Design a protein around this nucleic acid. Structure first.
Lengths: 72, 63
DNA sequence: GTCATTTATCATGC
DNA sequence: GCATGATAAATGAC
């Protein structure tokens, strides 16, 4: 349980790409989570965890360099 | 800022978790009476005990 | 009831 | 010493 290992650097870029491109509505559908899971090589449960962590930590970081990261 | 951007959790003690887990082994679903009994014994509200068993069952399915 | 979330904690990477 | 992924309380939609 919780054998934490950081995802691929490219996988993080993919997740970040979808997040900042859909910053108006950062809630991917079930089918959207599956596509992200395949590109990142992770599971859909790990996709939901990442978005769950990103949304609160983005809101937490509001607002310093997150405005810059909205260029994805 | 975005529209989607627009309390308070406290981790239970070891005693509370063990008793809640012990009862969960007997039955994954708990009646209104036993829920009140656990709430009184484990210093929680009836809703908290209710919510705990709901989360516990979901955890049990994910495993 | 389930179940996707929000949020704080936790544990580990580094 | 923080970042990050995962888990534990708590809420809300259905």
């Amino acid at each position: 349980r919780r054998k934490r290992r950081n995802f691929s650097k490219q996988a993080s870029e993919i997740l970040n790409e979808y997040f900042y491109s859909h910053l108006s509505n950062p809630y991917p559908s079930e089918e959207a989570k599956e596509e992200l899971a395949r590109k990142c090589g992770i599971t859909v449960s790990q996709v939901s965890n990442w978005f769950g962590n990103k949304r609160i930590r983005y809101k937490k970081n509001i607002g310093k360099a997150q405005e810059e990261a909205n260029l994805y | 800022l975005h529209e989607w951007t627009g309390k308070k959790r406290k981790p239970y003690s070891k005693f509370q978790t063990l008793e809640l887990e012990k009862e969960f082994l007997f039955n994954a679903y708990v009646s209104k009476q036993k829920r009140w009994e656990l709430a009184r014994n484990l210093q929680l509200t009836e809703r908290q005990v209710k919510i705990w068993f709901q989360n516990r069952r979901m955890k049990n399915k994910k495993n």
